[PDB]
Amino acid sequence: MQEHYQPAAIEPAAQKKWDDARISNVSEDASKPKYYCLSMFPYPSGKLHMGHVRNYTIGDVLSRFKLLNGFNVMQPMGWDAFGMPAENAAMKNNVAPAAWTYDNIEYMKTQLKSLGFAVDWEREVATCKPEYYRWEQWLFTKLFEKGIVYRKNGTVNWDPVDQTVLANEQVIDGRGWRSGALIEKREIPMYYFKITDYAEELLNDLDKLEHWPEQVKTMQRNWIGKSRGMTVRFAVSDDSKQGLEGDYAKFLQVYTTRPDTLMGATYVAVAAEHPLATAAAADKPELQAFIAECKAGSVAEADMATMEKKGVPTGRYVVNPLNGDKLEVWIANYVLWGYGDGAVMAVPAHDERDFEFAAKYNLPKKQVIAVGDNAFDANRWQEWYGDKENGVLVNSGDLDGLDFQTAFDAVAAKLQSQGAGEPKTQYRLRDWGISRQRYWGCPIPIVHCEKCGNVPVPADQLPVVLPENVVPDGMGSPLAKMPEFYETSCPCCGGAAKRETDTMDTFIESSWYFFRYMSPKFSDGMVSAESAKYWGAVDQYIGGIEHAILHLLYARFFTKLMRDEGLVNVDEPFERLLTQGMVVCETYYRENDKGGKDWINPADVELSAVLKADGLPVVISGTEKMSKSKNNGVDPQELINAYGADTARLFMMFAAPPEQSLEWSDSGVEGAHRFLRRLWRTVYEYLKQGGAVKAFAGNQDGLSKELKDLRHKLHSTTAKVSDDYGRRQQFNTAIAAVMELLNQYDKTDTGSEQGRAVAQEVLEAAVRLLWPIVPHICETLWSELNGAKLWEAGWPTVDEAALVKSEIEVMVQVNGKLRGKITVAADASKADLEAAALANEGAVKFMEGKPAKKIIVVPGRLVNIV
Numbered sequence: 077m078q079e080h081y082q083p084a085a086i087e088p089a090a091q092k093k094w095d096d097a098r099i100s101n102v103s104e105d106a107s108k109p110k111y112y113c114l115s116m117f118p119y120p121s122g123k124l125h126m127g128h129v130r131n132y133t134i135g136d137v138l139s140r141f142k143l144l145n146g147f148n149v150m151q152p153m154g155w156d157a158f159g160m161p162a163e164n165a166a167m168k169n170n171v172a173p174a175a176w177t178y179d180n181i182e183y184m185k186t187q188l189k190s191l192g193f194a195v196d197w198e199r200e201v202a203t204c205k206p207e208y209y210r211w212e213q214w215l216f217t218k219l220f221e222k223g224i225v226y227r228k229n230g231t232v233n234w235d236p237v238d239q240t241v242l243a244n245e246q247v248i249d250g251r252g253w254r255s256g257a258l259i260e261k262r263e264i265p266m267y268y269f270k271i272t273d274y275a276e277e278l279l280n281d282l283d284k285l286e287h288w289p290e291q292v293k294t295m296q297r298n299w300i301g302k303s304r305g306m307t308v309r310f311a312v313s314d315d316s317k318q319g320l321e322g323d324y325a326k327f328l329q330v331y332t333t334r335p336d337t338l339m340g341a342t343y344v345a346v347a348a349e350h351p352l353a354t355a356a357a358a359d360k361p362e363l364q365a366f367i368a369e370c371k372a373g374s375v376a377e378a379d380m381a382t383m384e385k386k387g388v389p390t391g392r393y394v395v396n397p398l399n400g401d402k403l404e405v406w407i408a409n410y411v412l413w414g415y416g417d418g419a420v421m422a423v424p425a426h427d428e429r430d431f432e433f434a435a436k437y438n439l440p441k442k443q444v445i446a447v448g449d450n451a452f453d454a455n456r457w458q459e460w461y462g463d464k465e466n467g468v469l470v471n472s473g474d475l476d477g478l479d480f481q482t483a484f485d486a487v488a489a490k491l492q493s494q495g496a497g498e499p500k501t502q503y504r505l506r507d508w509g510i511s512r513q514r515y516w517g518c519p520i521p522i523v524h525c526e527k528c529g530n531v532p533v534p535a536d537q538l539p540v541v542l543p544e545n546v547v548p549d550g551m552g553s554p555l556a557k558m559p560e561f562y563e564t565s566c567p568c569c570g571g572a573a574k575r576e577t578d579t580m581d582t583f584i585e586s587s588w589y590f591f592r593y594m595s596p597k598f599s600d601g602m603v604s605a606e607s608a609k610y611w612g613a614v615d616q617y618i619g620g621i622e623h624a625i626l627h628l629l630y631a632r633f634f635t636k637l638m639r640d641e642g643l644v645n646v647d648e649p650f651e652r653l654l655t656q657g658m659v660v661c662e663t664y665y666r667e668n669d670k671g672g673k674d675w676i677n678p679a680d681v682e683l684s685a686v687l688k689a690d691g692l693p694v695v696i697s698g699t700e701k702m703s704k705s706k707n708n709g710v711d712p713q714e715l716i717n718a719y720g721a722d723t724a725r726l727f728m729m730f731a732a733p734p735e736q737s738l739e740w741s742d743s744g745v746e747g748a749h750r751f752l753r754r755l756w757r758t759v760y761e762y763l764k765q766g767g768a769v770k771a772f773a774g775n776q777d778g779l780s781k782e783l784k785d786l787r788h789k790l791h792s793t794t795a796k797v798s799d800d801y802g803r804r805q806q807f808n809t810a811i812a813a814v815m816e817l818l819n820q821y822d823k824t825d826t827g828s829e830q831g832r833a834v835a836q837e838v839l840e841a842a843v844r845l846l847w848p849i850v851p852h853i854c855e856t857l858w859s860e861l862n863g864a865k866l867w868e869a870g871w872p873t874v875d876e877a878a879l880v881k882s883e884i885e886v887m888v889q890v891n892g893k894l895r896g897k898i899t900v901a902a903d904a905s906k907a908d909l910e911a912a913a914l915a916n917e918g919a920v921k922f923m924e925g926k927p928a929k930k931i932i933v934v935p936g937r938l939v940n941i942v
């Protein structure tokens with residue numbers, strides 16, 4: 077054994093040993109229990125940084141733990157390859173997105189191999205490859221013919237100067253981000269998943285996920301946004317019907333989640349596009365101007381909660397069907413057309429928004445709900461005004477005194493008897509818009525024929541292949557300019573036709589890749605039946621909280637869709653979810669000649685701080701999440717060249733609990749490295765003093781107290797680490813526990829024959845307990861200690877006999893006079909000592925049937941019965 081730890085030498089040799097043994101290349105082996113551990117696959121956008129590494133190290137720790145416990149572990153990796161990163165790199169470097177992507181994949185794959193993750197690379201997928209995306213095209217066509225996918229007009233941001241559709245993220249102040257031109261709202265045909273048809277299933281099945289973090293479930297419930305409310309119709313007054321047609325001339329319909337407050341409605345509000353709005357604005361130029369301002373605004377929820385709520389009165393009136401009040405209709409900028417009725421009732425006394433709107437325009441506030449003896453002031457909003465759970469109705473006729481639910485059901489019965497309303501369930505969830513006017517994405521398998529319409533591509537003709545010989549330049553999608561792509565024949569009639577040139581939302585690839593990993597070379601379907609039956613669902617999923625809503629909801633939705641197609645037999649894709657904390661790092665910049673800032677990478681600066689290239693100073697700025705945005709991503713390859721993969725992995729796992737943020741630290745890397753040399757030094761010095769022996773096992777009676785204590789520490793440590801990897805998933809405390817075992821080891825004389833056997837037992841356990849964290853050094857150290865294969869020796873077992881301490885002899889006194897002796901456990905409570913002392917032979921004789929006035933218990937010394 078070499079004296080000094082040399083990771084540059086031992087880490088490649090360990091990886092080759094694992095690769096040759098194929099321990100990470102797994103089949104559907106019925107002779108072993110399966111374990112599927114998945115980390116969220118990365119965008120191949122250039123280089124991974126230590127943040128990504130922390131994510132994948134957490135997954136590798138969990139995978140290697142289960143591997144050591146005899147599981148058949150699948151831990152797959154792949155590339156989430158479509159999307160805007162490559163399209164942007166094409167506009168900057170004039171290179172093809174495919175070429176840029178496959179280049180990044182090659183570099184990133186070596187980054188990962190360098191870290192020694194226990195990954196089944198035979199299951200690698202790259203989602204921009206036809207052999208992958210043909211199957212989401214397949215599912216698209218199957219759902220399109222069921223109407224689950226459908227085509228309909230939708231709104232987009234059209235930039236008239238750049239001649240391109242813009243995402244909302246690039247529309248600032250109503251204008252294009254790179255053009256500054258006024259953005260036009262265009263209606264264009266697009267494709268949608270009818271995810272609203274699955275809202276109830278998606279919501280209710282969250283209750284099955286007993287091992288998900290509750291905040292993620294809460295975020296999904298709030299996003300789906302189910303409500304149980306009431307449709308309510310207000311009859312249009314006789315004087316207010318001019319210009320109104322059909323049902324709009326007869327009533328104004330709204331939806332409310334508080335029908336228990338309908339007796340407190342004091343006005344009604346409608347969207348600018350509502351037919352009552354347009355009819356009252358016929359002769360009113362002020363309402364026309366207000367309607368136009370509304371249409372020229374951002375309907376985004378991000379802007380609307382921060383939006384000043386405004387309105388104008390219409391001079392039209394409707395009638396409350398419960399109390400007969402005549403309420404004026406207002407046009408209001410917060411009521412959105414298309415979200416149900418486009419009209420709402422207002423109850424200022426019990427809704428905070430209505431209260432402020434009514435305080436602005438001095439509109440009436442009518443209390444209809446009281447909470448106990450609480451004081452109600454119409455000139456100040458109090459949180460109890462909206463309390464739905466502890467109120468009763470006041471000022472409500474025969475509804476007075478009821479709670480929320482009873483009033484809700486009573487209002488429903490009364491409204492239904494008059495034909496003026498009925499219960500209704502609504503969801504905030506909207507259908508999922510699939511179409512992207514972008515090149516680097518999965519083509520939509522639709523052919524447009526002037527005779528047949530929108531026709532899906534037959535399954536025998538999939539994939540519709542995206543051409544890779546393309547360099548986009550933002551002047552619109554190049555697919556719409558390539559007739560050798562869009563010119564085709566109709567699959568139904570054979571006539572000339574045109575391929576759809578929009579591509580798919582790239583969330584589609586990540587909505588099912590976890591099933592493709594189960595059979596990534598299967599060419600007859602999305603996933604083979606045998607492999608889906610074997611692997612079931614993902615046992616453990618690890619990824620950032622930024623994907624807790626959309627990505628997870630889409631993945632759950634695709635799972636249910638695939639189940640409904642008979643492709644899988646699980647309802648939910650991920651059984652457990654670990655959301656790792658972000659790795660953060662200080663940033664550095666230099667003022668640009670254009671007045672901007674040149675963000676510099678920490679690996680190219682020196683520290684007052686200077687750039688490592690010229691010696692001129694650079695500015696030290698704030699510490700934030702590692703990302704390419706501020707160029708503060710630490711490349712693991714640089715850490716590995718300087719210290720080794722095990723150091724990188726150990727620092728990430730030790731610096732903080734996995735869910736807590738983790739600050740980059742040169743000092744932390746050095747501490748991790750010193751511990752690895754301590755571990756190496758410990759085993760080297762042990763083997764220098766005599767060589768390897770058979771580890772102690774079996775009956776420890778006759779071992780010295782010092783060695784019994786070390787075995788107690790050993791098996792306590794094994795129990796703790798097993799619980800930290802397996803239940804708590806807290807790796808920093810697992811490493812700290814092994815450090816404590818070594819500290820006790822260092823303080824124990826292990827030179828005797830029995831001492832060397834216990835030493836061997838301790839070291840053989842330490843190196844296996846740490847193998848999930850630092851497998852390279854632990855693999856090498858194991859092989860110097862023991863001849864068996866580490867993965868066949870398995871996870872260390874807890875010797876329960878090593879955990880029992882010795883019994884203690886206690887004196888039994890009666891009124892301070894020694895009357896007997898008792899033997900009790902070291903863990904014996906004060907009540908067990910009292911029990912045992914009272915039953916002592918000499919005690920019961922010298923008590924003379926008299927009861928104990930008091931019993932004094934000195935733990936480990938005596939019991940005095942008075």
Ligand SMILES: CC(C)C[C@H](N)C(=O)NS(=O)(=O)OC[C@H]1O[C@@H](n2cnc3c(N)nccc32)[C@H](O)[C@@H]1O
Nearest residue numbers: 116117118119127128131156586619620658659702
């Ligand atoms: C399933 C797909 C939709 C995932 C998608 N391709 C993606 O986000 N791909 S990705 O490549 O963007 O991130 C891959 C994973 O790495 C984490 N991750 C990123 N930055 C990190 C940081 N600073 N600290 C710590 C962790 C960090 C990030 O949460 C994610 O789980």
Ligand SMILES: [Mg+2]
Nearest residue numbers: 283284285286
């Ligand atoms: Mg269950």
Ligand SMILES: [Zn+2]
Nearest residue numbers: 525528566569
């Ligand atoms: Zn046709």
